[PDB]
Design an enzyme around this catalytic site. Structure first.
Site, PDB file in Angstrom:
ATOM      1  N   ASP A   1      -2.704   3.032   6.615  1.00 34.92           N
ATOM      2  CA  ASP A   1      -3.866   2.693   7.045  1.00 34.92           C
ATOM      3  C   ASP A   1      -4.086   2.247   8.372  1.00 34.92           C
ATOM      4  O   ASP A   1      -4.707   1.602   8.909  1.00 34.92           O
ATOM      5  CB  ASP A   1      -4.598   1.576   6.183  1.00 34.92           C
ATOM      6  CG  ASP A   1      -4.913   2.058   4.657  1.00 34.92           C
ATOM      7  OD1 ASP A   1      -4.814   3.033   4.495  1.00 34.92           O
ATOM      8  OD2 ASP A   1      -5.134   0.958   4.017  1.00 34.92           O
TER       9      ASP A   1
ATOM     10  N   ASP B   1       0.903  -1.235   0.048  1.00 36.61           N
ATOM     11  CA  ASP B   1      -0.133   0.081   0.280  1.00 36.61           C
ATOM     12  C   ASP B   1       0.792   1.281   0.107  1.00 36.61           C
ATOM     13  O   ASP B   1       1.951   1.416   0.644  1.00 36.61           O
ATOM     14  CB  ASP B   1      -0.792  -0.064   1.288  1.00 36.61           C
ATOM     15  CG  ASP B   1      -2.099   0.761   1.126  1.00 36.61           C
ATOM     16  OD1 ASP B   1      -2.302   1.957   0.770  1.00 36.61           O
ATOM     17  OD2 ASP B   1      -3.023   0.139   1.908  1.00 36.61           O
TER      18      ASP B   1
HETATM   19  N1  LIG Z   1      -6.381   5.872   0.557  1.00 39.32           N
HETATM   20  C1  LIG Z   1      -5.876   6.380   1.921  1.00 39.32           C
HETATM   21  N2  LIG Z   1      -5.617   5.640   3.101  1.00 39.32           N
HETATM   22  C2  LIG Z   1      -5.104   6.632   3.722  1.00 39.32           C
HETATM   23  C3  LIG Z   1      -5.317   7.864   3.283  1.00 39.32           C
HETATM   24  C4  LIG Z   1      -5.054   9.344   4.154  1.00 39.32           C
HETATM   25  C5  LIG Z   1      -5.211   9.332   5.276  1.00 39.32           C
HETATM   26  N3  LIG Z   1      -4.042   8.575   6.221  1.00 39.32           N
HETATM   27  C6  LIG Z   1      -6.417   8.987   5.781  1.00 39.32           C
HETATM   28  O1  LIG Z   1      -6.265   8.098   6.960  1.00 39.32           O
HETATM   29  O2  LIG Z   1      -7.759   9.111   5.619  1.00 39.32           O
HETATM   30  N4  LIG Z   1      -5.861   7.742   2.073  1.00 39.32           N
HETATM   31 MN   LIG Z   2      -5.210   0.657   1.935  1.00 39.61          MN
HETATM   32 MN   LIG Z   3      -3.838   2.927  -0.256  1.00 34.03          MN
END
Ligand SMILES: Nc1ncc(C[C@H](N)C(=O)O)[nH]1
Ligand SMILES: [Mn+2]
Ligand SMILES: [Mn+2]
Ligand SMILES: Nc1ncc(C[C@H](N)C(=O)O)[nH]1
Ligand SMILES: Nc1ncc(C[C@H](N)C(=O)O)[nH]1
Ligand SMILES: [Mn+2]
Ligand SMILES: [Mn+2]
Ligand SMILES: [Mn+2]
Ligand SMILES: [Mn+2]
Lengths: 315, 315, 315
Positions: free
Chosen positions: C124, C120
């Protein structure tokens, strides 16, 4: 130093798509000969072989255009041997990769101790009985390997072939679309290969180190580089019949050829499978042709770090 | 921590194509200053140098706009030294790469022990007598090297230059379009370089390890990073005067700058050769500018693995 | 050998953009099931989970659609555990990455000793209190880690969760957009990660060697691969909600999955964040879907060097 003998091989019947017979034309048009002369190179053009039409050439089993392919390779073998006896590096402009039967055969007549580096997405090692497509550009290596004598039926057009290389005298680089019978042959004969998985694992630096040590370790010997532009990613060489994603980068292709140049052992070269008709736009064609020319110039000494003549430039 | 002093150098006469003088503008417009402040950065903008027109500036031999180039570099040297004496990292937004004569000169006035990393497709080391183009952006390094004193004629506009670096105090990374006299100078002076062949062989990780050990091995000293966006592949930085295929990737450029940041020794930085007029589409321009900004932010600590302040975030 | 159990998870409320719920559809349409059967694979389709609408689902603090996300993950956990008890490798087609709470939870019910590889651009790993976006696809890992119990408030929809993995049982690969609180959690908990900086430094070969040795070194155990297509560069997987430049290449993604296949320990797989609505053109969609299918086939044995059955092909 090194003398070059250019051979155009405008030939397409090792596969179905017309246009690859124009490769020698677009490569010359791109100024290859002049650009070679710009380097250290003593360059002689042996012209474009005139491959006469063989109108009566029905398949052998499912193998297509066998007499045409066999005869083109026979003629090219003749010509490559002439260039080699003239003490020049043969440079075959293809044309589809079936021509490698003749190019390597003819080379080996003059230098039987040769080793082959085969740069390609494909292994091109089906036999007439393991092919499913019937296209002879997917079989040239099977005709050349001594171990596969017994396995190659008498195909019309190829009675002149004598296998000239052993499984231990070829290395593949670039592989990413290999048929099951082909993979069986690789593992059974113990052929040395760097699929894209190995290039990813090791890096192209270590791949070339190992390729060259494998072929030259015991003793120096002439190298035959059979370069299928489809070994490079389609983002660099799209105008080709059978592009496969995930290929060698432009940098990796220059790296391979720069390292082969540096051995001083390049003895014959094939630049194959350029098919200008298959570019989706004029720019895909020039992109492909330009890349092929750059690969070719690296084989004859053009170095990304630069080059100079043995004079004092600070005058 | 680290203070930054931004200097715009809207200057193009080191080469023929107009538009590179807009680099400081599009970089600021892209929000560079604000994005820097978002990091640890204490940022002071010293403005855009006002380079007055020098209408009477006929070539010296074949060297073009020498008085213009010499004076712009003289002025920039003045300003970079001011920023350095103010205890800040100088950040020169170019502008064509001829400005490096002034940027490195001015830096060296305050830190004579500096070492240079030069990221570029080109070595920019022609002298006024080995250049064939006459463009001064292809000569800055020759003016700076002590070993090449004796070889630099008295060019109008440059009487103020004193060579401030030795051949052993620069490393090149990215090289892939080097003229023959330039290659001779590299080999003769024993300059350290990683052409794209070396980056391919070793990987950018080992390239930076060796670059930094070569420059910092004996003792720490200030680093000057002169980054020509044409060192990156044109698929990332197309809006530049002289793109050359087969360049450093976006990842490799961030890797180089992340590792330089981590030394804590970055002392001056040039971000050069952005030419918005030369993007084929609006998106080529934003692509180029965005990449340049990302390179710049990495120089000042932005890390792909992430960054946090020294607080407890689990509150 | 290895049995597969396909689960479609047409679910989007872990993030704002509609269309990711179509991922299972376009992946099936691309012929995934048939292509899997073409390999060694014993393939059972468990269908697309029917996620009923939860019309009353107002944010919890700033966390959006919590009941919807929690329940979808609860349902998916149920189904993955069923597939695992049926002795099959679970293959979850997403759907947004919030579903990993359920996929890993359900897997761990049957195999508590599992280790996770998380591919990724993003970690996350925000908690409900460190998120700034409120999107639950940016939080799944925080719900799964035992160390972060104490830090996860009682969010409606998630009362069924029990953290099932320790910080030492996950490895990230691909990271390049990590929030500050997330980076703090990585460093505080000592999580193992290969950001794109590490992939650049070491090469994907060494990254996988270290990833696998870190997870399997002490003893073999089941692997859960949670693959977010946004881990690959947008030049390969553009149809995704949050593309980030500078990603893993197509080659690197096949390398990762080929090496995981070769362990014989793949036990569950997530293919997430394909959003066909977000391709700029039809070709961006097919490009993305094709890449996802290729990644998936590599997980189940498709090798770039080729594959053959244990028969004698020379007949
Ligand atoms: N696709 C995605 N995963 C995480 C993000 C940005 C940010 N850390 C969030 O937690 O929203 N964007
Ligand atoms: Mn992800
Ligand atoms: Mn992602
Ligand atoms: N260009 C190309 N070379 C080989 C192939 C596919 C297949 N092995 C065949 O033998 O036809 N395609
Ligand atoms: N951009 C750029 N830098 C150098 C060149 C070409 C050539 N060495 C010259 O000195 O003009 N081009
Ligand atoms: Mn071929
Ligand atoms: Mn091929
Ligand atoms: Mn430059
Ligand atoms: Mn340059």
């Amino acid at each position: 130093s090194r003398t070059i003998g250019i051979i155009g091989a405008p030939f397409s019947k090792g596969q179905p798509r017309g246009g690859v017979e124009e490769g020698p034309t677009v490569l010359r048009k791109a100024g290859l000969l002049e650009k070679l002369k710009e380097q250290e190179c003593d360059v002689k053009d042996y012209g474009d072989l005139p491959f006469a039409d063989i109108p009566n050439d029905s398949p052998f089993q499912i193998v297509k255009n066998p007499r045409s392919v066999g005869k083109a390779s026979e003629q090219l073998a003749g010509k490559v041997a002439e260039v080699k006896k003239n003490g020049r590096i043969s440079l075959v402009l293809g044309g589809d990769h079936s021509l490698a039967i003749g190019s390597i055969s003819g080379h080996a007549r003059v230098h039987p101790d040769l080793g082959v580096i085969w740069v390609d997405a494909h292994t091109d090692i089906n036999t007439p009985l393991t092919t499913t497509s019937g296209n002879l550009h997917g079989q040239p290596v099977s005709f050349l390997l001594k171990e596969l004598k017994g396995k190659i039926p008498d195909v019309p057009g190829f009675s002149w072939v004598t296998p000239c290389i052993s499984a231990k005298d070829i290395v593949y680089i670039g592989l990413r679309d290999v048929d099951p019978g082909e993979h069986y042959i690789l593992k059974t004969l113990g052929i040395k290969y760097f699929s894209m998985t190995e290039v990813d694992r090791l890096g192209i630096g270590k791949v070339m180190e190992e390729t060259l040590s494998y072929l030259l370790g015991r003793k120096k010997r002439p190298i035959h580089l059979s370069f299928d532009v489809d070994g490079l990613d389609p983002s660099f060489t799209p105008a080709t019949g059978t592009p496969v994603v995930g290929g060698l980068t432009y940098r990796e292709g220059l790296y391979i050829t720069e390292e082969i140049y540096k051995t001083g052992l390049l003895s014959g070269l094939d630049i194959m499978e350029v098919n200008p008709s298959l570019g989706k736009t004029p720019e895909e064609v020039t992109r492909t042709v330009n890349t092929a020319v750059a690969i070719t110039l690296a084989c004859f000494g053009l170095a990304r770090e630069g080059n100079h003549k043995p004079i004092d430039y600070l005058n």
